[PDB]
Amino acid sequence: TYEDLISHKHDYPKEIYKESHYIRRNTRLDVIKKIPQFEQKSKEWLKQRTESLTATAISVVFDEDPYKHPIVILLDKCGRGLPGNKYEQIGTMFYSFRNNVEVGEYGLLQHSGHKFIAASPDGICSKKANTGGLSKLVGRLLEIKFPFSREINNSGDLDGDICPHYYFLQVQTQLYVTEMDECDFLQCKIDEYDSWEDFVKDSNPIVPGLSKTTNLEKGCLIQLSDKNLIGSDDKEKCLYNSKYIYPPKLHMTNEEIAAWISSEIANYHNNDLSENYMIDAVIYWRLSQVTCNLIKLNKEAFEEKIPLLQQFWDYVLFYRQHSDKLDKLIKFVEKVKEDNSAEIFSYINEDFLSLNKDSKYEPLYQEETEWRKKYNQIKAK
Amino acid sequence: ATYEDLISHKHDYPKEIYKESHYIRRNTRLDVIKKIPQFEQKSKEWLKQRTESLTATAISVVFDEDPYKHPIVILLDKCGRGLHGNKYEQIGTMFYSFRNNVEVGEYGLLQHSGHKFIAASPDGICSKKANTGGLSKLVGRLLEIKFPFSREINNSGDLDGDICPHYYFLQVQTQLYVTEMDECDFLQCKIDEYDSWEDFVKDSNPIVPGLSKTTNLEKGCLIQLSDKNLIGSDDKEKCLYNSKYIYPPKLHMTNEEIAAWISSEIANYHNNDLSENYMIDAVIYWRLSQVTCNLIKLNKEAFEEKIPLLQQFWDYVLFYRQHSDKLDKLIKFVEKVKEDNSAEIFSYINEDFLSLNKDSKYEPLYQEETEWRKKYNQIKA
Ligand SMILES: [Mg+2]
Ligand SMILES: [Mg+2]
Numbered sequence: 103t104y105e106d107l108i109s110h111k112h113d114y115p116k117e118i119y120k121e122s123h124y125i126r127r128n129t130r131l132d133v134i135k136k137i138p139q140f141e142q143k144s145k146e147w148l149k150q151r152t153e154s155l156t157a158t159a160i161s162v163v164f165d166e167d168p169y170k171h172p173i174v175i176l177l178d179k180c181g182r183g184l185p186g187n188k189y190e191q192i193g194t195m196f197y198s199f200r201n202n203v204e205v206g207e208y209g210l211l212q213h214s215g216h217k218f219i220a221a222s223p224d225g226i227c228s229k230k231a232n233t234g235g236l237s238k239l240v241g242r243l244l245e246i247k248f249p250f251s252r253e254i255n256n257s258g259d260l261d262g263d264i265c266p267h268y269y270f271l272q273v274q275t276q277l278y279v280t281e282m283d284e285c286d287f288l289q290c291k292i293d294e295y296d297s298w299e300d301f302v303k304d305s306n307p308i309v310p311g312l313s314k315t316t317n318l319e320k321g322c323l324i325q326l327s328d329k330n331l332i333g334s335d336d337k338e339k340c341l342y343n344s345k346y347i348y349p350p351k352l353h354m355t356n357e358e359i360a361a362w363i364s365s366e367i368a369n370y371h372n373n374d375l376s377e378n379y380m381i382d383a384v385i386y387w388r389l390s391q392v393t394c395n396l397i398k399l400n401k402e403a404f405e406e407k408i409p410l411l412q413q414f415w416d417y418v419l420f421y422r423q424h425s426d427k428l429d430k431l432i433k434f435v436e437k438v439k440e441d442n443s444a445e446i447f448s449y450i451n452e453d454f455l456s457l458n459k460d461s462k463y464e465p466l467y468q469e470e471t472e473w474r475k476k477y478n479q480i481k482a483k
Numbered sequence: 484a485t486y487e488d489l490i491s492h493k494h495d496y497p498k499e500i501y502k503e504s505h506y507i508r509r510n511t512r513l514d515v516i517k518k519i520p521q522f523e524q525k526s527k528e529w530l531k532q533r534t535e536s537l538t539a540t541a542i543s544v545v546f547d548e549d550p551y552k553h554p555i556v557i558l559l560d561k562c563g564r565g566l567h568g569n570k571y572e573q574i575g576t577m578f579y580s581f582r583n584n585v586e587v588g589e590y591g592l593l594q595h596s597g598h599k600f601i602a603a604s605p606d607g608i609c610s611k612k613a614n615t616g617g618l619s620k621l622v623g624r625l626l627e628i629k630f631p632f633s634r635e636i637n638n639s640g641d642l643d644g645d646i647c648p649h650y651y652f653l654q655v656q657t658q659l660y661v662t663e664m665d666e667c668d669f670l671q672c673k674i675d676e677y678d679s680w681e682d683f684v685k686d687s688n689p690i691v692p693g694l695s696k697t698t699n700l701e702k703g704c705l706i707q708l709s710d711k712n713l714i715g716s717d718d719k720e721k722c723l724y725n726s727k728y729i730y731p732p733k734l735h736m737t738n739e740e741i742a743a744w745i746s747s748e749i750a751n752y753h754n755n756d757l758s759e760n761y762m763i764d765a766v767i768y769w770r771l772s773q774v775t776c777n778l779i780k781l782n783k784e785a786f787e788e789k790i791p792l793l794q795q796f797w798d799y800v801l802f803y804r805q806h807s808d809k810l811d812k813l814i815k816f817v818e819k820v821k822e823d824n825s826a827e828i829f830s831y832i833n834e835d836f837l838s839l840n841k842d843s844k845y846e847p848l849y850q851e852e853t854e855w856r857k858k859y860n861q862i863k864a
């Protein structure tokens with residue numbers, strides 16, 4: 103009854119892609135694989151992070167983010183201030199399984215034309231179906247969120263209600279960078295079992311790979327603890343700074359689970375992360391609620407907003423080379439609060455125009471965006 | 484047996500006025516401390532007070548005697564650059580106040596009289612007032628409460644190294660030096676939270692309701708208040724950093740008065756000042772599982788021998804606060820050679836300092852590893 107969970111709705115019936123969009127998406131993905139990924143925390147990876155605005159920052163720069171204001175993005179890219187998730191891959195394996203397509207993760211990708219706009223999608227579906235043949239999901243991005251207190255809505259506007267707007271802008275920027283058309287917005291709630299006993303207790307009788315209370319997959323997770331830190335540290339720095347070893351596939355039998363845990367222990371002497379991280383605990387998880395919503399790219403609507411992003415990045419490049427004016431800017435934001443974007447960026451645009459006498463740039467955020475007004479309205483009460 | 488059997492009266496003072504000299508000096512010092520204004524912790528004016536001094540948690544790092552941070556991060560922090568915890572502190576206080584029969588007060592950040600760049604903020608100081616009336620011998624005794632989750636609490640071995648981790652010992656030393664007191668109780672607590680109110684009332688000790696029958700330590704309730712600015716945020720920092728808490732009035736409450744306090748607190752929450760900025764979130768039920776207390780006395784001479792190093796470090800901080808260019812190129816220099824190489828980093832810093840102060844007689848810091856750095860390196864490798 104396990105094979106009944108593999109949906110074949112996206113299996114492509116032909117050997118070669120006939121429709122044009124499938125061909126272009128596959129070709130673009132093949133171009134993406136040719137783009138070199140880089141090792142973490144070293145090499146050009148710094149020259150990739152500092153040279154662009156990540157997709158999660160674009161919602162803030164648009165003045166359409168409900169928690170951060172543009173000045174924090176401006177100061178972050180200049181190294182100043184004021185004073186992912188651990189289950190993501192599990193979601194990837196769920197989507198790859200139930201939709202019968204191979205999903206690959208790729209590092210940070212910068213847009214070809216506007217290099218200062220970059221994004222890192224949680225995964226892109228390849229052309230290969232799992233049960234053989236091609237798949238219709240080729241080139242479809244994956245964006246997976248794990249809210250803890252927020253309730254997942256399935257009705258209402260796609261831009262506002264089903265998908266939170268800042269996440270919607272993140273997906274739009276991701277689709278713009280990778281030059282793809284579709285992205286699946288997957289929202290998952292995960293509970294962890296107290297013990298292995300409770301894990302085997304909640305097993306669905308007819309199907310061992312599911313939970314009997316949520317009718318969704320369950321599995322294991324290996325936690326690798328940082329060494330420098332932790333050892334005897336005392337807070338939540340340890341949680342964020344853990345890395346994880348993930349199971350090979352879902353719907354594992356209990357024996358295969360324990361055998362894989364042990365083999366992972368023995369071979370961790372050769373695991374690179376275990377040499378730099380210590381095997382901590384073994385977590386047992388189950389999916390409790392999974393929603394998926396297709397999001398398509400509006401390219402013209404984003405290109406209309408590219409000029410604003412260009413002006414913002416020009417401000418970043420400006421204050422990166424003038425440390426004195428950056429200090430006096432920090433004092434100016436110290437005076438009037440950081441949510442007052444109109445005055446802050448009027449000051450910033452003056453500072454910019456003072457040394458660039460041929461810039462037609464006008465101050466940004468002079469009027470609240472419609473989303474800013476909506477958020478402030480939601481604040482009352 | 485009533486809960487009053489747990490109240491130790493060993494520190495009850497029999498007279499009305501303090502006769503002995505040390506009690507008089509400690510009480511007078513406490514009265515002097517009360518006149519110095521403290522700010523609303525965690526918010527602005529406090530955070531501005533911290534930037535003008537080296538806090539007690541930084542001294543272990545500056546001494547090159549901290550196993551997790553190196554002095555360069557303290558230097559860069561004070562110049563505005565980069566690159567089961569506090570929530571139960573009050574609960575710990577209420578435990579210490581109960582079993583030791585003394586009133587404990589919080590006093591915020593205090594700066595040292597002579598060296599104003601050395602400041603400390605104790606988790607609490609015992610007043611002269613005993614709980615059952617009269618004076619107490621614990622007047623002026625500092626309180627420092629720690630909540631390890633993975634660290635094992637040791638009961639034997641060195642006080643400076645084994646019972647109290649060395650960095651914590653230096654924190655307590657700085658607190659005793661700043662507050663000009665003589666003794667501090669180092670309290671270490673482990674707390675687990677109940678799944679349900681049912682488990683709370685079931686785990687009540689029969690003869691004494693205020694204790695747990697499985698841990699033989701106090702249990703109680705706690706009200707969690709979530710920030711309003713953040714509603715649906717998917718960060719764990721969301722409220723857990725920005726949350727405020729409503730605490731019970733006393734320990735050893737009966738179940739009925741517990742429920743009455745929860746209900747009355749919920750209903751009256753609208754007249755609360757916090758009601759306009761915070762929402763009642765969850766109600767947590769806690770019990771203590773392990774509590775250790777260890778007396779630590781001040782070694783004033785050993786700290787004053789180390790004050791010159793702190794003065795030189797703070798002079799470096801004041802130096803780079805005025806030279807943004809040299810701070811930028813310093814940060815790039817720390818990008819080159821790693822942050823753990825304090826000898827090279829602060830040789831560079833001493834060069835940069837002597838270039839504009841050609842007669843300050845300062846020699847490079849951290850040219851040789853401290854013995855504690857050696858021990859930590861042995862444990863790390
Ligand atoms: Mg991103
Ligand atoms: Mg993501």
Ligand SMILES: [Mg+2]
Pocket residue numbers: 538539540603604
């Ligand atoms: Mg402190």
Ligand SMILES: [Mg+2]
Pocket residue numbers: 605606627628
């Ligand atoms: Mg503390």
